[PDB]
């Protein structure tokens, strides 16, 4: 809104805890910013090294999902069917940033 | 969007450089976050002390305006008739926050 950032990624697949990859093989770093009543994830498109993909056993306990898939009405649906609202998608200090908010399951 | 923050202030009047007051006499602290191609102001509703109102002569050089007035389509019009897009209005760490983006004059 008032930006020239373009379209958000169609999908984000986890590689290692907190590091995702989109349909273009670009890496995104996700950090948790937990509020009292809810959880937000700030995801930035930053080129980071990739080592081994983590085992799902380690990822089961994470606060972030295994995957996000672009869903109608500017939000993402994860692997557990939960919806994440895109609160903002902008360029910050030259880096593309998504601000996601985990919504209550309806 | 996905928030329960409510309505943004109808107006913000500068008191001292970077410190504004809304229609309820509540103080808001504004900081500049300048990008390469544009300028953003992050404004948070935080209770701060108020001393003397600054003289307009000192405020003429500031990057922030003397006042913001809520304008249709979620944006603010300042004292110079410029428009600022509200990119986000949310509660961050318990503090209400506005993220404004100065748009090119049209």
Swiss-Prot record, chains A, B:
GO biological process: intracellular signal transduction
Superkingdom of source: Eukaryota
An example Gene Ontology molecular-function term: protein serine/threonine kinase activator activity
Swiss-Prot/TrEMBL keywords: Chromosomal rearrangement, Proto-oncogene
Tissues where this protein is expressed: Not found at a significant level in any tissue.
Function: Enhances the phosphorylation and activation of AKT1 and AKT2.
Subunit structure: Interacts with AKT1 and AKT2 (via PH domain). Does not interact with AKT3.
Involvement in disorder: Detected in T-cell leukemia bearing a t(X;14) translocation. Plays a key role in T-cell prolymphocytic leukemia.
Family: Belongs to the TCL1 family.
Alphabetized PANTHER family for the sequence: PROTEIN P13 MTCP-1 (PTHR14060:SF8)
Protein name: Protein p13 MTCP-1
Gene symbol of the encoding locus: MTCP1
């Amino acid at each position: 809104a008032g930006e020239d950032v373009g379209a958000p990624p169609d999908h984000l697949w986890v590689h290692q805890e907190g590091i995702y990859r989109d349909e273009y093989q670009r890496t995104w770093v996700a950090v948790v910013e937990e509020e009292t009543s809810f959880l937000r994830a700030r995801v930035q498109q930053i080129q980071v090294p990739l080592g081994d993909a983590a085992r799902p056993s380690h990822l089961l306990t994470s606060q972030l999902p295994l995957m996000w898939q672009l869903y109608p009405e500017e939000r993402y649906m994860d692997n557990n069917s939960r919806l994440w609202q895109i609160q903002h998608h902008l360029m910050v200090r030259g880096v593309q940033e998504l601000l996601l908010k985990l919504l209550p399951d309806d």
